[PDB]
């Protein structure tokens, strides 16, 4: 029921200096660290309250590690240029996400280590944490090399080791926010678009985590094709927002109910417009 993820982005930019390297760390839907090689003084920095308690050996070490990782990713951008026969005057991107999902018992469920080159799949560690999925011929060169170097076993050592252990720690230190039920504060609005019709919109605000279901029903059945859904969006305060909208014949509003599901709620809400 919990996960820790690191997202690394390396972007080349001929004429704009060395390639830029950005790393962000998440626990569930909460970001807790950041790194940016472009910063005046590049360091791993806190972006959540419960992480700031870590001592100098954590921030110094993560900073040195990010600076090291940035250089390796720059090396890797160059290697990829050779794999793909591409020009050094071109701009490219390496994206890597890795981390672990642990269950409610606190034990490892799945490990991750997958990547993309220029927005398309490159290479991914499989669920067995022992084989790879290379997405193209260039990535098959990498797969070939990583098998020899026993890379998967070392990824697996981290994912079973430090990853789950630090995740368990993070969950405990920030138990008051990371493990709290934050149900959406819901309401339904109404704006008649014409004489014939009117717009019903169901809001869900201030919820965590981001996972939510907003469905309209008419007489108890979903208007799946008629309902306009917006993408779940950050509020800016670590919470998320969403709204489902459906356009209905004015007078028949009461046939329509908005159904809200969230893990911060005791049981699923059923809403109606009220004046």
């Amino acid at each position: 029921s919990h996960s820790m993820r690191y997202f690394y982005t390396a972007m080349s930019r001929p004429g704009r200096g060395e390639p830029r390297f950005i790393a962000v760390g998440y626990v569930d839907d909460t970001q807790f660290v950041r790194f940016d090689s472009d910063a005046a003084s590049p360091r791993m920095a806190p972006r959540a309250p419960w992480i700031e308690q870590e001592g100098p050996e954590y921030w110094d070490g993560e900073t040195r590690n990010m600076k090291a990782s940035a250089q390796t990713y720059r090396e890797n951008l160059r290697i990829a240029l050779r794999y793909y026969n591409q020009s050094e005057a071109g701009s490219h991107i390496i994206q890597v996400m890795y981390g672990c999902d642990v269950g409610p018992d606190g034990r490892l469920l799945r490990g991750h280590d997958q990547s993309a080159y220029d927005g398309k799949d490159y290479i991914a560690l499989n669920e067995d944490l022992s084989s790879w999925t290379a997405a193209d011929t260039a990535a098959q060169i990498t797969q070939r090399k990583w098998e020899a170097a026993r890379v998967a076993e070392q990824l697996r050592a981290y994912l079973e080791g430090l990853c789950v252990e630090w995740l368990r720690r993070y969950l405990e230190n920030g138990k008051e926010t990371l493990q709290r039920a934050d149900p959406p504060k819901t309401h339904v609005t109404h704006h008649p678009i014409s004489d014939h019709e009117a717009t019903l919109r169901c809001w869900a605000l201030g919820f965590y985590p981001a996972e939510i279901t907003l469905t309209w029903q008419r007489d108890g059945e979903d208007q799946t094709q008629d309902t306009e859904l917006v993408e779940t969006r950050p509020a800016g305060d670590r919470t998320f927002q969403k709204w489902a909208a459906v356009v209905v014949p004015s007078g028949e509003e009461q046939r329509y109910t908005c159904h809200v599901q969230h893990e911060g709620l005791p049981k699923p809400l059923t809403l109606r417009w009220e004046p």
């Binding site: 690191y6 790393a23 760390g25 954590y58 090291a68 990782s69 890797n76 990853c163 630090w166």
Partner: peptide, 9 residues
């Protein structure tokens, strides 16, 4: 905590 692994592709 991030992994320490300077890995070439």
């Amino acid at each position: 905590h991030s992994i320490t692994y300077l890995l070439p592709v």
